[PDB]
Design a protein around this ligand. Structure first.
Ligand SMILES: *[C@@H]1O[C@H](CO)[C@@H](O[C@@H]2O[C@H](CO)[C@@H](O)[C@H](O)[C@H]2NC(C)=O)[C@H](O)[C@H]1NC(C)=O
Ligand SMILES: *[C@@H]1O[C@H](CO)[C@@H](O[C@@H]2O[C@H](CO)[C@@H](O)[C@H](O)[C@H]2NC(C)=O)[C@H](O)[C@H]1NC(C)=O
Ligand SMILES: *[C@@H]1O[C@H](CO)[C@@H](O[C@@H]2O[C@H](CO)[C@@H](O)[C@H](O)[C@H]2NC(C)=O)[C@H](O)[C@H]1NC(C)=O
Ligand SMILES: *[C@@H]1O[C@H](CO)[C@@H](O[C@@H]2O[C@H](CO)[C@@H](O)[C@H](O)[C@H]2NC(C)=O)[C@H](O)[C@H]1NC(C)=O
Ligand SMILES: *[C@@H]1O[C@H](CO)[C@@H](O[C@@H]2O[C@H](CO)[C@@H](O)[C@H](O)[C@H]2NC(C)=O)[C@H](O)[C@H]1NC(C)=O
Ligand SMILES: *[C@@H]1O[C@H](CO)[C@@H](O[C@@H]2O[C@H](CO)[C@@H](O)[C@H](O)[C@H]2NC(C)=O)[C@H](O)[C@H]1NC(C)=O
Ligand SMILES: *[C@@H]1O[C@H](CO)[C@@H](O[C@@H]2O[C@H](CO)[C@@H](O)[C@H](O)[C@H]2NC(C)=O)[C@H](O)[C@H]1NC(C)=O
Ligand SMILES: *[C@@H]1O[C@H](CO)[C@@H](O)[C@H](O)[C@H]1NC(C)=O
Ligand SMILES: *[C@@H]1O[C@H](CO)[C@@H](O)[C@H](O)[C@H]1NC(C)=O
Ligand SMILES: *[C@@H]1O[C@H](CO)[C@@H](O)[C@H](O)[C@H]1NC(C)=O
Ligand SMILES: *[C@@H]1O[C@H](CO)[C@@H](O)[C@H](O)[C@H]1NC(C)=O
Ligand SMILES: *[C@@H]1O[C@H](CO)[C@@H](O)[C@H](O)[C@H]1NC(C)=O
Ligand SMILES: *[C@@H]1O[C@H](CO)[C@@H](O)[C@H](O)[C@H]1NC(C)=O
Ligand SMILES: *[C@@H]1O[C@H](CO)[C@@H](O)[C@H](O)[C@H]1NC(C)=O
Ligand SMILES: *[C@@H]1O[C@H](CO)[C@@H](O)[C@H](O)[C@H]1NC(C)=O
Lengths: 170, 435, 197
């Protein structure tokens, strides 16, 4: 196998020699020479996603190592820690704007100005408190006739497949 | 034999009408799933964990893994779209002024509490306590989940945090309370809550003087209903059944996918390393192919089940978005759509992977028999009610509303004439007063 | 502009292209070409490879049909929604909120598009609002007068009754209002004169 061997405190009985897991993978072993218990762990791995504005715009990209602390990480000096992982190549900004490239856990990324990729907390909207009281009513004095557009799919492509021709052509 | 219900025959006749004389303000609860767990699967790690020979043999089977990954990513994006559609229906983050005199109604249990770290409400916190999440997708530093992670199955965190969902529901609630349905059309227009409730009463066919002359009773009934909602959501643990069921189904699917790795599928062993160590390349290729095919079919079944369940969740989220648009951003004339009874309003609350609507409805309470008539003859003309129904308590005739007994003397302002008194079936004789 | 329709077309085209490209996979056979297997092997030896190719391509077709069935269910739901919007927004005026566009719905106009429909929803949106002082009712001669259709407003000195969606103040008369009981119950009642025509 391949993995990291660590000292273990598992309570192996004197007759046992190895331990299994849910998927029947050996998670602990007994050293044949020095009868100690070793825990076997997968070494280290994770997903790597690439945040990028279109290649029409810029070839500069940011990288997201998903679900890892910013210590187990090509690698710029712009590391940032999101609940979704470690974000390298994005300058975190205390401002908040509308989400442009959703990264996760409320963190979004955009390409903005000397332009660079920035990461920020997405903005839900501008705050607005209603001037409410028990003898005040706001009544409109004018109107606006708006024309909105709504697009709805209706049908799709009618496809036909020749099973014999596709599988066993002539 | 199961019972459909208690039999009940309606005392019907052609000159008898039952009209309610009192009402009840009910607050029902409706739970709707919105999103599910965003899962990601590493095809190579799941099928051929750290094995070059298995990976090389897996390259033969084409692009099954790429389309499994594409399907999972599509579902993952769809979940955030569902949440955004249900909750992000408000253009601005509204908020109420510090004064909390909403015409005697007590909204303190649904408005946010600043004391808590997350600015959730009391009922929202109860809802979050009633549902336990197997995994939120957050960072897991160095179980039934470690086995999943080591085999390539991970969970992605949702784009909108629970705090953002709480802020969205707070904006919706503040807009509803301080502006009625006006914030769903254009800019929010402030209006006293008593006047907003008077409009809501007018919207179901009851005159506003009923609300104004019974304001304290209605406020007390609403407060009692909210308190009963609190008690029910704090007592019965099995309250949010649907959301917990969604979480359980996703977790069970992942656990089944992991346990499928211990199947031999006809090979000598389920462990790739044992096959590699005990057999030559020619002999081990057959066993590795069997394991690859079995695990690929298991992944296919998991993705198919996920796609069908995601379609179901998308339908539920569309329904929740419609209920937010129609029940919360306005008053609904649709029957049994925003709760049982005549709909007055609704209040949204977030919950793990779902939304909860507190539907406030008006239910007639105490009905009485009366003798009715389609029309009335005064001077050879037939008088019909402009808005209401003719009733009689035994000796005198009045005209009342159709949903609340408020009899008034039959005058020419209440009624309109149409033709003579030789056509209407069931007409009666009475005097119509002239102001 | 028409993102959804183009997305549908792209998804179908991509599915067909994937189905075609699956024909170049060996699936464990010596070759992905049927003719090469037939020419280089005897019947007994070639049957195994042909079976492997047949099984792989059959599974690929199964995946394509399953994806198509799920996507067709999605498109059918969308088409049912479009039919409902045609019935309610175009063939009539809708009271449902945010169903035929944001705002108070006036009308809608349909337009065709490749594999889809486009609705131009005409809606009415209030524009310029002003503050006013309001009151649930009014006392004239010991009776409480409530608006028949509208809301009582005041510009600072005088009291009028207006519509709820458009400021059109009118003198409070007995035709605008109706009486209900006395003036000892309503909370927030005010004092004003009701004109008698
Ligand atoms: C209501 O709004 C409309 C436009 O939103 C106003 O019409 C404009 O009036 C100004 C001043 O006379 C003109 O310069 C514009 O050309 C008009 N626009 C249009 C489209 O007609 C209208 O005056 C407003 N009414 C009130 C009472 O404020
Ligand atoms: C309508 O029903 C409500 C309650 O359903 C009645 O209010 C109750 O009245 C009794 C008698 O005065 C009190 O003891 C209760 O405390 C009241 N309850 C509440 C919640 O206020 C009301 O009296 C009924 N009205 C009519 C006309 O029957
Ligand atoms: C609205 O209801 C809440 C509770 O349902 C009220 O808060 C209670 O107030 C009493 C007296 O002030 C306290 O003894 C309780 O401990 C409070 N409970 C909670 C949970 O806060 C609140 O006072 C009500 N609102 C109004 C305006 O009366
Ligand atoms: C039906 O309602 C009428 C209207 O109130 C009743 O007539 C009144 O009865 C009371 C008895 O307490 C008298 O004091 C009033 O003078 C009566 N008014 C008129 C205009 O007649 C009548 O008694 C009711 N009848 C029944 C059977 O309930
Ligand atoms: C309602 O009143 C009318 C008029 O008072 C009644 O019509 C009378 O009916 C009797 C008997 O059929 C005739 O003799 C009269 O000539 C009718 N008068 C008129 C003016 O047409 C009618 O019968 C009454 N209805 C009831 C149910 O009592
Ligand atoms: C509120 O509206 C009333 C009604 O128009 C105003 O009263 C009028 O004010 C104008 C001033 O230009 C006078 O010419 C009229 O004679 C007044 N009419 C009456 C019946 O009094 C009043 O001034 C307005 N007040 C405010 C604060 O806007
Ligand atoms: C509205 O008008 C009524 C009647 O003009 C006022 O009622 C009077 O109140 C005073 C002070 O409480 C009493 O001394 C009078 O006897 C009352 N008159 C009547 C006929 O009841 C009432 O106070 C006024 N309301 C406001 C807010 O000014
Ligand atoms: C095994 O051999 C090693 C060295 O060859 C020795 O140090 C150790 O004590 C031995 N242990 C046993 C159980 O024989
Ligand atoms: C380049 O692509 C971006 C998409 O991020 C778009 O906003 C921009 O307008 C494009 N520019 C050109 C010149 O096509
Ligand atoms: C990362 O590890 C450090 C210690 O090595 C710890 O203090 C920190 O909380 C960790 N952060 C995350 C997000 O795991
Ligand atoms: C954001 O603000 C905090 C304090 O409010 C500060 O410590 C931090 O350096 C700021 N970040 C940036 C990128 O300026
Ligand atoms: C409005 O409510 C406040 C309590 O917050 C009260 O003091 C005030 O008198 C009320 N105004 C009217 C006009 O009733
Ligand atoms: C009601 O209908 C019955 C027939 O079932 C009839 O005999 C009776 O006269 C009717 N009552 C009135 C008031 O018309
Ligand atoms: C009306 O009278 C009938 C007569 O049998 C009775 O059954 C019914 O309960 C009464 N309805 C009400 C509301 O009292
Ligand atoms: C009404 O008055 C309040 C007082 O603060 C103000 O904030 C609000 O903008 C006013 N509304 C309108 C429509 O002018």
């Amino acid at each position: 196998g391949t993995g990291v061997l660590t000292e273990s405190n598992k309570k192996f009985l004197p007759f046992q020699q190895f331990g299994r897991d849910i998927a029947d993978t050996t998670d602990a072993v007994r050293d044949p020479q020095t009868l100690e218990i070793l825990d076997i762990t997968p070494c280290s791995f994770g997903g790597v996603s690439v945040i990028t504005p279109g290649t029409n715009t810029s070839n500069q990209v940011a990288v997201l190592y998903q679900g890892v602390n910013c210590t187990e990480v090509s690698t710029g000096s712009n590391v940032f820690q999101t609940r979704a992982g470690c974000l390298i190549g994005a300058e975190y900004v205390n401002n908040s704007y509308e989400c442009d490239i959703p990264i996760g856990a409320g963190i979004c990324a955009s390409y903005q100005t000397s332009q660079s990729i920035i990461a920020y907390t997405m903005s839900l909207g501008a705050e607005n408190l209603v001037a409410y009281s028990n003898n005040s009513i706001a009544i409109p004095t004018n109107f606006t006739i708006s024309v909105t557009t709504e697009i709805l799919p209706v049908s799709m492509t009618k496809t036909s497949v020749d099973c014999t021709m596709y599988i066993c052509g002539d | 034999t199961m019972s459909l219900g208690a039999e009940n025959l309606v005392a019907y006749s052609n000159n008898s009408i039952a009209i309610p004389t009192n009402f009840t303000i009910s607050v029902t609860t409706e739970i709707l799933p919105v999103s599910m767990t965003k899962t990601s699967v590493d095809c190579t790690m799941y099928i051929c964990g750290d094995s070059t020979e298995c990976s090389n043999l897996l390259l033969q089977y084409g692009s099954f893994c790429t389309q499994l990954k594409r399907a999972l990513t599509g579902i993952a994006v769809e979940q955030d779209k569902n949440t955004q559609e249900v909750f992000a229906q408000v253009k601005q983050i509204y908020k109420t002024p510090p004064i909390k005199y909403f015409g005697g109604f007590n909204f303190s249990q649904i408005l946010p509490d600043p004391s808590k770290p997350s600015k959730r409400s009391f009922i929202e916190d109860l809802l979050f306590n009633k549902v336990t999440l197997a995994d939120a997708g957050f960072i897991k530093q160095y179980d039934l989940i470690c086995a999943q992670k080591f085999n390539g199955l991970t969970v992605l965190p949702p784009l909108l945090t629970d705090e953002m969902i709480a802020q969205y529901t707070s904006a919706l609630l503040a807009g509803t309370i301080t502006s009625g349905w006006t914030f769903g059309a254009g800019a929010a227009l402030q209006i006293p809550f008593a006047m907003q409730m008077a409009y809501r009463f007018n919207g179901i066919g009851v005159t506003q003087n009923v609300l104004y002359e019974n304001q304290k009773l209605i406020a007390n009934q609403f407060n009692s209903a909210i308190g009963k909602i609190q008690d029910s959501l704090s007592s019965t643990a099995s309250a949010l059944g649907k959301l917990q069921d969604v979480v359980n189904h996703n977790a069970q699917a992942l656990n089944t996918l992991v346990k499928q790795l211990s199947s031999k599928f006809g090979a000598i062993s389920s462990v790739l390393n044992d096959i590699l160590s005990r057999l030559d390349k020619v002999e081990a290729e057959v066993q590795i192919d069997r394991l690859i095919t079995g695990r690929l079919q298991s992944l296919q079944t998991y993705v198919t089940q996920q796609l069908i369940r995601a379609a179901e969740i998308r339908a539920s989220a569309n329904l929740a978005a419609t209920k937010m648009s129609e029940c919360v951003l306005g008053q609904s004339k649709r029957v049994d759509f925003c709760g049982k009874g005549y709909h007055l309003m609704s209040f949204p609350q977030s919950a793990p992977h779902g939304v909860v609507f507190l539907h406030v409805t008006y239910v007639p309470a105490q009905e009485k028999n009366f003798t009715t008539a389609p029309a009335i003859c005064h001077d050879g003309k037939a008088h019909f009610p402009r808005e209401g129904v003719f009733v009689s308590n035994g000796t005198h005739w009045f005209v009342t509303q159709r949903n609340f007994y408020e009899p008034q003397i039959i005058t020419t302002d209440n009624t309109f004439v149409s033709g003579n008194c030789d056509v209407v079936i069931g007409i009666v004789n009475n005097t119509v007063y002239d102001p």
